[PDB]
């Protein structure tokens, strides 16, 4: 049904686990930050994006910030 991710889904460098959904006519990846017990029914990729100033209930990845 969906992948229930833990805190150790993507442990590569600084690329955190993100639940990304690709937008239709928008060049933005609609990503939710993966936490312990997230029912990820979307593409669980490992991206770095910005966890420095952003990182709430939603995050938009501009493509060139993910290695998956």
PDB file of C-alpha atoms in Angstrom:
ATOM      1  CA  UNK A   1       0.000   0.000   0.000  1.00  0.00           C
ATOM      2  CA  UNK A   2       2.677   2.470   1.076  1.00  0.00           C
ATOM      3  CA  UNK A   3       6.179   2.516   2.501  1.00  0.00           C
ATOM      4  CA  UNK A   4       6.306   3.328   6.196  1.00  0.00           C
ATOM      5  CA  UNK A   5       9.669   5.038   6.502  1.00  0.00           C
ATOM      6  CA  UNK A   6      11.849   5.261   9.572  1.00  0.00           C
ATOM      7  CA  UNK A   7      14.618   7.745  10.502  1.00  0.00           C
ATOM      8  CA  UNK A   8      17.138   5.639   8.588  1.00  0.00           C
ATOM      9  CA  UNK A   9      15.634   5.514   5.105  1.00  0.00           C
ATOM     10  CA  UNK A  10      18.283   7.593   3.350  1.00  0.00           C
ATOM     11  CA  UNK A  11      21.558   7.811   5.244  1.00  0.00           C
ATOM     12  CA  UNK A  12      23.790   9.206   2.513  1.00  0.00           C
ATOM     13  CA  UNK A  13      25.954  12.274   3.206  1.00  0.00           C
ATOM     14  CA  UNK A  14      23.332  14.944   3.939  1.00  0.00           C
ATOM     15  CA  UNK A  15      20.565  13.675   1.670  1.00  0.00           C
ATOM     16  CA  UNK A  16      17.529  13.272   3.907  1.00  0.00           C
ATOM     17  CA  UNK A  17      14.522  11.032   3.100  1.00  0.00           C
ATOM     18  CA  UNK A  18      11.757  13.019   1.444  1.00  0.00           C
ATOM     19  CA  UNK A  19       8.286  12.028   0.260  1.00  0.00           C
ATOM     20  CA  UNK A  20       8.102  13.714  -3.127  1.00  0.00           C
ATOM     21  CA  UNK A  21       5.180  14.079  -5.497  1.00  0.00           C
ATOM     22  CA  UNK A  22       5.778  15.483  -8.969  1.00  0.00           C
ATOM     23  CA  UNK A  23       3.575  18.408  -9.979  1.00  0.00           C
ATOM     24  CA  UNK A  24       1.622  18.398 -13.243  1.00  0.00           C
ATOM     25  CA  UNK A  25       2.414  21.682 -14.982  1.00  0.00           C
ATOM     26  CA  UNK A  26       4.825  22.981 -12.380  1.00  0.00           C
ATOM     27  CA  UNK A  27       8.576  22.376 -12.147  1.00  0.00           C
ATOM     28  CA  UNK A  28       8.382  21.775  -8.408  1.00  0.00           C
ATOM     29  CA  UNK A  29       8.660  18.550  -6.449  1.00  0.00           C
ATOM     30  CA  UNK A  30       6.053  18.582  -3.709  1.00  0.00           C
ATOM     31  CA  UNK A  31       7.993  16.968  -0.922  1.00  0.00           C
ATOM     32  CA  UNK A  32       7.126  16.184   2.670  1.00  0.00           C
ATOM     33  CA  UNK A  33       9.900  15.608   5.200  1.00  0.00           C
ATOM     34  CA  UNK A  34      10.182  11.964   6.170  1.00  0.00           C
ATOM     35  CA  UNK A  35       9.859  11.283   9.870  1.00  0.00           C
ATOM     36  CA  UNK A  36       9.626   8.129  11.969  1.00  0.00           C
ATOM     37  CA  UNK A  37       6.401   6.389  11.011  1.00  0.00           C
ATOM     38  CA  UNK A  38       5.510   8.270   7.838  1.00  0.00           C
ATOM     39  CA  UNK A  39       3.199   6.363   5.511  1.00  0.00           C
ATOM     40  CA  UNK A  40       5.052   7.336   2.360  1.00  0.00           C
ATOM     41  CA  UNK A  41       2.767   6.521  -0.540  1.00  0.00           C
ATOM     42  CA  UNK A  42       4.906   8.612  -2.857  1.00  0.00           C
ATOM     43  CA  UNK A  43       8.462   8.660  -4.190  1.00  0.00           C
ATOM     44  CA  UNK A  44      10.695   8.432  -1.116  1.00  0.00           C
ATOM     45  CA  UNK A  45      13.849  10.027  -2.485  1.00  0.00           C
ATOM     46  CA  UNK A  46      17.009  11.215  -0.766  1.00  0.00           C
ATOM     47  CA  UNK A  47      17.541  14.923  -1.341  1.00  0.00           C
ATOM     48  CA  UNK A  48      19.526  17.663   0.365  1.00  0.00           C
ATOM     49  CA  UNK A  49      17.381  20.595  -0.754  1.00  0.00           C
ATOM     50  CA  UNK A  50      17.175  23.029   2.142  1.00  0.00           C
ATOM     51  CA  UNK A  51      16.816  21.789   5.690  1.00  0.00           C
ATOM     52  CA  UNK A  52      18.609  24.910   6.841  1.00  0.00           C
ATOM     53  CA  UNK A  53      15.822  27.500   6.696  1.00  0.00           C
ATOM     54  CA  UNK A  54      12.958  25.476   5.271  1.00  0.00           C
ATOM     55  CA  UNK A  55      11.455  22.198   6.436  1.00  0.00           C
ATOM     56  CA  UNK A  56       7.905  22.097   7.760  1.00  0.00           C
ATOM     57  CA  UNK A  57       4.760  20.251   6.677  1.00  0.00           C
ATOM     58  CA  UNK A  58       5.739  20.815   3.049  1.00  0.00           C
ATOM     59  CA  UNK A  59       8.841  21.568   1.014  1.00  0.00           C
ATOM     60  CA  UNK A  60       9.287  22.293  -2.680  1.00  0.00           C
ATOM     61  CA  UNK A  61      12.359  20.819  -4.345  1.00  0.00           C
ATOM     62  CA  UNK A  62      13.498  22.540  -7.536  1.00  0.00           C
ATOM     63  CA  UNK A  63      14.642  19.208  -9.035  1.00  0.00           C
ATOM     64  CA  UNK A  64      18.390  19.921  -8.848  1.00  0.00           C
ATOM     65  CA  UNK A  65      18.591  19.223  -5.122  1.00  0.00           C
ATOM     66  CA  UNK A  66      18.023  15.483  -5.063  1.00  0.00           C
ATOM     67  CA  UNK A  67      20.351  12.594  -5.928  1.00  0.00           C
ATOM     68  CA  UNK A  68      17.518  10.114  -6.387  1.00  0.00           C
TER      69      UNK A  68
END
